Amino acid sequence: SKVKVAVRVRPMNRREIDLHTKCVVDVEANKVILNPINQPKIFAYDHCFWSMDESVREKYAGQDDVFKCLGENILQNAFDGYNACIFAYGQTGSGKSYTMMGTADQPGLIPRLCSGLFERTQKEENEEQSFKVEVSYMEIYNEKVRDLLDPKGSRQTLKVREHSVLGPYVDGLSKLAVTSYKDIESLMSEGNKSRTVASSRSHAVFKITLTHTLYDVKSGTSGEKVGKLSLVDLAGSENINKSLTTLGLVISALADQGAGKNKNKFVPYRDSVLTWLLKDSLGGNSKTAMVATVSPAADNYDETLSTLRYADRAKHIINHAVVNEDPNARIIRDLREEVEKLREQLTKAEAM
Amino acid sequence: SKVKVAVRVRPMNRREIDLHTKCVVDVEANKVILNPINQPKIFAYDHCFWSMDESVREKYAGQDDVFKCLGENILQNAFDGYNACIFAYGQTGSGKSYTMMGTADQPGLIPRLCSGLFERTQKEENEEQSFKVEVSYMEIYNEKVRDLLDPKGSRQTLKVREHSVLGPYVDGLSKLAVTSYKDIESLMSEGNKSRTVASSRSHAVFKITLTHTLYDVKSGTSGEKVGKLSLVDLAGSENINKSLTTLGLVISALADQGAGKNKNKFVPYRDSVLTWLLKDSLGGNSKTAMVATVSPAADNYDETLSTLRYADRAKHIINHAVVNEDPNARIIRDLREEVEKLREQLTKAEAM
Ligand SMILES: Nc1ncnc2c1ncn2[C@@H]1O[C@H](COP(=O)(O)OP(=O)(O)O)[C@@H](O)[C@H]1O
Ligand SMILES: Nc1ncnc2c1ncn2[C@@H]1O[C@H](COP(=O)(O)OP(=O)(O)O)[C@@H](O)[C@H]1O
Ligand SMILES: [Mg+2]
Ligand SMILES: [Mg+2]
Ligand SMILES: [Mg+2]
Ligand SMILES: [Mg+2]
Ligand SMILES: [Mg+2]
Ligand SMILES: [Mg+2]
Numbered sequence: 001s002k003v004k005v006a007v008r009v010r011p012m013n014r015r016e017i018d019l020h021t022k023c024v025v026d027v028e029a030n031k032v033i034l035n036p037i038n039q040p041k042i043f044a045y046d047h048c049f050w051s052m053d054e055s056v057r058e059k060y061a062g063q064d065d066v067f068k069c070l071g072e073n074i075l076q077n078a079f080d081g082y083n084a085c086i087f088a089y090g091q092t093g094s095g096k097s098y099t100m101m102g103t104a105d106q107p108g109l110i111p112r113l114c115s116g117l118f119e120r121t122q123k124e125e126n127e128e129q130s131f132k133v134e135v136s137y138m139e140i141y142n143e144k145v146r147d148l149l150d151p152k153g154s155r156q157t158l159k160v161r162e163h164s165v166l167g168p169y170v171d172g173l174s175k176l177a178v179t180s181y182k183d184i185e186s187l188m189s190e191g192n193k194s195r196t197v198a199s200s201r202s203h204a205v206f207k208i209t210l211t212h213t214l215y216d217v218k219s220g221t222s223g224e225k226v227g228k229l230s231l232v233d234l235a236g237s238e239n240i241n242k243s244l245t246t247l248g249l250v251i252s253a254l255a256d257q258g259a260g261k262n263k264n265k266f267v268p269y270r271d272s273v274l275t276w277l278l279k280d281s282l283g284g285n286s287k288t289a290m291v292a293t294v295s296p297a298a299d300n301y302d303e304t305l306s307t308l309r310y311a312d313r314a315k316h317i318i319n320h321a322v323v324n325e326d327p328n329a330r331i332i333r334d335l336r337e338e339v340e341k342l343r344e345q346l347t348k349a350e351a352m
Numbered sequence: 353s354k355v356k357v358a359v360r361v362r363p364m365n366r367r368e369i370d371l372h373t374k375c376v377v378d379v380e381a382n383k384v385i386l387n388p389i390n391q392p393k394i395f396a397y398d399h400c401f402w403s404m405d406e407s408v409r410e411k412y413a414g415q416d417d418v419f420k421c422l423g424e425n426i427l428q429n430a431f432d433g434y435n436a437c438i439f440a441y442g443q444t445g446s447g448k449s450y451t452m453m454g455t456a457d458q459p460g461l462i463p464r465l466c467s468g469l470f471e472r473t474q475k476e477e478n479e480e481q482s483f484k485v486e487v488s489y490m491e492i493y494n495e496k497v498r499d500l501l502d503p504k505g506s507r508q509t510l511k512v513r514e515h516s517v518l519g520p521y522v523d524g525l526s527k528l529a530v531t532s533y534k535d536i537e538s539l540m541s542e543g544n545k546s547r548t549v550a551s552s553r554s555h556a557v558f559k560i561t562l563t564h565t566l567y568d569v570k571s572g573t574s575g576e577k578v579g580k581l582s583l584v585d586l587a588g589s590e591n592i593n594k595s596l597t598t599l600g601l602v603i604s605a606l607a608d609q610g611a612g613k614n615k616n617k618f619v620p621y622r623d624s625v626l627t628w629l630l631k632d633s634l635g636g637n638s639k640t641a642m643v644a645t646v647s648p649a650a651d652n653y654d655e656t657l658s659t660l661r662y663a664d665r666a667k668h669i670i671n672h673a674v675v676n677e678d679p680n681a682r683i684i685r686d687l688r689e690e691v692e693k694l695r696e697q698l699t700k701a702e703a704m
Binding site for chain 2: 127132161163164165166174176177179215216217218220221222326327328329331332335336338339342343345346349350352
């Protein structure tokens, strides 16, 4: 598990069509080549989604093209009891919301994972397996946390705590159990609503929990696997930017390790509430992926190079995803083997 | 744990006031004495709620008097990880719904346990304990099962199955996670609505699940206790009555055991879907209680004696309530003690 990095290129926006601004980005399979405005810097990633002109065949990547490559991965991960995570990263206007959430006519990953999760939760209920789904949705702005699923609209601040069983958590963040996609969307389109202005410097964290119960009908016992999917919508990469810049720190420190540099210096998860809550999604117990979104416009070249050079560093982060099973089952297994080993040493010592 | 039996006496109804029908029931502490219409048969129970004339002091038992004696018990039971159960039993008009559910101005046990459960769930959230609450509400009529929390109103039939991990269950019965009393009451007043007519030969089962999570902040581990409360509203005791009469069978077979009669003949839980689903609430893993409701009217004397003689038999049923913890924790505990015992026998046999 190294962090999987996609790059998505959006179409030229209206001003750029009018001004006939020049394309400096191009895509060749999984390579994206940053041309000079006038040296052409070339980067390679896991995927490269060219979303520039719909009227193409082999090239165009629409929203369900993005979902087959990434949403289908994180979905499989959940059912196998993994923590998964997708960050959208890049400048304002480059397309972070379109990819995460989409528009009403072009749904992004979040409505498509939700739709496809209940479609697969419903298809595998079978008297040996059940599934409970909880959902949470928090926004972070100015290093404060708000609950976007709060129906009273308080926009109250919730404090972050640490825990020896949960880890860092937001105290009083609602987790809403949900049984159909219509349950969430009737809370969560109001969560996309309840977002600040002056609007692009806040991060949205959407977290879905899948509890997979499994039944040993022969043994009569039951266990539970839990996956957690976190869909993270960052502020624009272009005390208001403490989280974003700390997230810069933490991606380089990690990318340096595995590359074997500063193996002994500690990753500063602690400093911003964003890096500290997503501690585990960054070099921890998480199948994590990143979507660097870029504008192809030549007027954006500098933030585009920033974003391509973050995306290139994040691909060197090593993850430690394990399956969130029950500690006890393996403790019993190894205790029983000591009993068997010790019972043999007993009859291997009666002869004395 | 023997089954706890209350008797509740309702006021004379309108016809009985007009006709000045005579009271044949009287209550002395926990004894209720059935006078002759014209031998006065006397029975003793755990409680005796005289709800006949409100204008009394030492005698009257109103709805919160009933709840302090019984609802508070079943509530404590749940938080300690027990299965609990209250059956209301008796003839039509004797007061089974008033006691279980009550009227809008006189709430019964079910709204008062719900109110008091969230009031105590909210008072003990404390970063070492959390609580998840699920709820289900099924009706049984003509040995078919309907879901009273089904919002489409299908009134579809759901089949009963057996299971080696769940036991007998109703397949496709919704279990709705709920976070406040207003969540349930906005589904469940519609469940009291969706009930048949021609109306008094159906049983309502209201089942609330309390999942108590506990955190070992020193050990960093987590366990879950689960209580189940079943609030059962029977048909009137006066293929439509298969469940009710089978429930008669099953209460006598059980009451005979412990009294040591027919120890070898098997309790016929299997025959009706009511006795088979509530198998465990009858002589099984349940802190179970029964409320025999009676009319004081002399025109009801015969069903009153029936009901008092059921209530007297049910008090001899023995329950086997255990705390629904994790099998594994005790399996580890005993495995570790064998390792310690076997390590000593090893150094108690090196000397040979
Ligand atoms: N691939 C795309 N295809 C069509 N429209 C897009 C695409 N990407 C972005 N857009 C549109 O361009 C604007 C990009 O803004 P947005 O995606 O909200 O970016 P961010 O949140 O990253 O600033 C939005 O109005 C979006 O709907
Ligand atoms: N203790 C009581 N105090 C006042 N009214 C009662 C009492 N018990 C019953 N009633 C009223 O008498 C009628 C009894 O019917 P109900 O309780 O529905 O009985 P069941 O469901 O047992 O037939 C109801 O209308 C109820 O509201
Ligand atoms: Mg955005
Ligand atoms: Mg996650
Ligand atoms: Mg960018
Ligand atoms: Mg009734
Ligand atoms: Mg029960
Ligand atoms: Mg009666």
